[PDB]
Design a protein around this ligand. Sequence first.
Ligand SMILES: [Mg+2]
Ligand SMILES: [Zn+2]
Lengths: 114, 55, 104, 98, 67
Amino acid sequence: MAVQISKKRKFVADGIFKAELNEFLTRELAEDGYSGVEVRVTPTRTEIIILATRTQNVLGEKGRRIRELTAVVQKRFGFPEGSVELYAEKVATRGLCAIAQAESLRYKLLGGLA
Amino acid sequence: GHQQLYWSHPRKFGQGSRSCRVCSNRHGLIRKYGLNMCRQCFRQYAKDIGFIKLD
Amino acid sequence: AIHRIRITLTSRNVKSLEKVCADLIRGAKEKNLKVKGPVRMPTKTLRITTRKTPCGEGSKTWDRFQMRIHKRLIDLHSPSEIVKQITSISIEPGVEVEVTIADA
Amino acid sequence: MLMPKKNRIAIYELLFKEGVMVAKKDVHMPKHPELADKNVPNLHVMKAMQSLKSRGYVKEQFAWRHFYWYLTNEGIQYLRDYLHLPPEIVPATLRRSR
Amino acid sequence: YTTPKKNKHKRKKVKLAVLKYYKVDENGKISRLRRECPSDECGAGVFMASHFDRHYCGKCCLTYCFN
RNA sequence: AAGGGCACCACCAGGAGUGGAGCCUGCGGCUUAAUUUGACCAACACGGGAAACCUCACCCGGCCCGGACACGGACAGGAUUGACAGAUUGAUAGCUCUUUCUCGAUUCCGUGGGUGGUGGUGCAUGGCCGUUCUUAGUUGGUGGAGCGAUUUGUCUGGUUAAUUCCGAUAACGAACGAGACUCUGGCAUGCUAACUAGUUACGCGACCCCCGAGCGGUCGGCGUCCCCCAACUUCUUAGAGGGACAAGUGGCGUUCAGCCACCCGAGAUUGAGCAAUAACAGGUCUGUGAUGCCCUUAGAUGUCCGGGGCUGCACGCGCGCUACACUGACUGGCUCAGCGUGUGCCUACCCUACGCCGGCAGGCGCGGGUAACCCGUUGAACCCCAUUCGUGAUGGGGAUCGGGGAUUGCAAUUAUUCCCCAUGAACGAGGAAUUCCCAGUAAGUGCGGGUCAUAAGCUUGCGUUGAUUAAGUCCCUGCCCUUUGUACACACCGCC
Ligand SMILES: [Mg+2]
Ligand SMILES: [Zn+2]
């Protein structure tokens, strides 16, 4: 109805949300090996999967980082309470993730390697 | 200045009202489909949004 | 109970949308529901043509970006109540569903 | 920054209540979406956290147009004594159910 | 540069001594030597100005000229 | 210099033009306080750059700190914050100023140190993009020839749009590019379906009929998923599939690679997207919380507010619009589209049916649409059919200019746009030159999208009407391969 946004604007909005979420995670989990983000959004609650090489890092001590990131994305995008979760998964074959290798090369060059 | 002229100028419309949602720029904006994004920024995030290139 | 529900599906890639259209209707046949065929609404093409350059200097090249939106409608209309009979949507990421009765 | 004390405490307890802070980079925005009732301007929120970052009690990440401050352990005890708390109350991020 | 206007003087507050603007008599009966701000939010605690023709509340901004 | 091949960013044969006129717009110049600035095939309706404010970077002024943090002073006997009146100011900026109130540790001063910057540097850079080049080109490994740079592979020849293939072969085996690929167009009375698409049928009507038709003709009038209260998918939509392969015939060819013609076929070459090695001191620091260095940082090169400018005109150029008329203009009648948009995180601003008022632009109420449901059977233009004009700068052309009326906005003057009445200027097919183009193409013609409170002479797409010429060449301008010459290597815009 009137409250609902049109499908044309709607599907553009979801692409905007994914692009904005990817950029935020790219800047934050860069040194942690962030590979990509998968968003399985459902009408009831959405869910966000973070693809990173070093999962025990994206999840801090007792999962403080993930709880923070879950709260941080909750406030920015106005998600309703308890309707969004963040999962962290290890990406298989990290040598075939161009993002992971490019981030690894960035870290090596910043270290001082030739 | 004092609370009655710092932002006093009306900005309900025009280029000043609208800025890129990514880089806060006011030039070459794309307000179609509710993007509100920069001409250059859209080319950067076109793949992530879903705008692929067919022809 | 007596119910009639209009299920509308919308996505970007046809392969997933055609897949999800299958298991709802195929699940309903096993559930011996009546199923009007999946009506294919005309595909919406969102076309944004942006100049390729970020400088304004060049040979006036323009970049054509297309976004295809595909909509499909499935009308599950069994004699008995349907919401309890169809308690699942069994979707995949990328497709949006909107359960809707005849009142809307 | 010349923000009133009531606004400054309002930012701090909100930052403590959940150990994260999100604010859009807009100094002319009349009110922060959270704490709109306190009538704290968005400018006060941005500048208050900038002071915390320089002192090291918070770490800042900026996306397109939103700050994403995360309260650190060095900020746990500082907000604890500013609001006069013994080491028992934690931000939501620090503990859930444990 | 070489701007024609001389650099504008910015205000330095006078630095006033402690208020002490109410006195007593014969070992102490209170007598406010200024004016009370009558508004609800000014209240009793604050006092009004004593200009040469009006009285002014620092918070409530009320002004009372005797013409 | 020779031998071969190729290209409407080359020509030929033509078409439409541009250059000539008025106007729009972008450059240069001139002018200015400023008329911000980049760019000079591959700049000049380009920076998505249609700027009243904002944008804004320029000019004339006026506020603010949005100068973190540390250290030292200063301070609850007040560090500091706001403010009424008068003056003052462009200003209802307590910016100053008299005046005292008020605030309460949030600041204030100094020293270090931030931070910001549409400030410089694209000749410090990333990324992107343009171009060399959309031509067919490019590179290892092992082997061979060389003292060596290098060379062979990567070729005499035939063929191809293509170092594409066929073949010889000190080369063999490969890699990228091309091709394959992706999207789109053309055909499927074959499949799946559709009360958000329809068609046929039936039943109601409404009319014309009437001779009498009667299963008559017309209806975008109404029903039959208002589920029992039609079918079907031809037309519409969109999925899975099929279809075209030089497949068949004849000829040419080393009878190989392939080429030409024809039958059957919707189609025997539909358009795009992607697009190699190497490079350019090509463009962008004015897209970015991309960035190095430098500069500025409280009388700011930060930021905000007011006004002006970006439009300014002896002149030169570029992209276009309108025309010069009768193959026309005007007035009326008739009758046909397709892309595609439509109410907003911030964010204020949507597309509009119908009724009424008005001559028009418009105004006022009532609805519909977050959309195959409403605008909308998108009743578009050209065109078509009738009328007037009649070869004159004329009813061509509508520039310039006066008066008046609306809409947007906080604000319309240097006219935002629109409407009405008046003036009716050059212009009678445009010198030398020069652009684009091979079939639903050029061109005529309108309609959407972007920009957009207001708006298109721009651009990006769409449909409509629909040709002339050509199936060739290297003549001009260039490209590719081989041979050759060279005093050239910043590479003929070279050297001397
Ligand atoms: Mg006339
Ligand atoms: Zn942008």
